[PDB]
């Protein structure tokens, strides 16, 4: 049996959030796609949180 678990991808995929259409960049617009991954290495992220 398996030991480790990356439950995050399971959660994203099961609810239907994660898909090619969701990640596709919008056409002729500046709003971000339906799914966005943030960064925890850029300085000041936790301060903004």
């Amino acid at each position: 049996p398996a030991q480790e678990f990356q439950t995050a991808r399971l959660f994203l995929s099961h609810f239907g959030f994660l898909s090619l259409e969701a990640l596709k960049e919008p056409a002729n617009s500046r709003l971000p796609p339906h799914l966005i991954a943030l960064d925890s290495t850029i300085p000041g992220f936790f301060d903004d949180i």
């Binding site: 398996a2 480790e4 678990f5 990356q6 991808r9 399971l10 995929s13 099961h14 994660l18 090619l20």
Partner: peptide, 24 residues
């Protein structure tokens, strides 16, 4: 030697879903 959805997109979607879910 002398010698109806397209199957490829469905197979690609199934492979991506399977890899995301069951890998590991």
């Amino acid at each position: 030697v002398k010698s109806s959805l397209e199957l490829i997109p469905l197979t690609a979607r199934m492979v991506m879903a399977h890899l995301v879910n069951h890998l590991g």
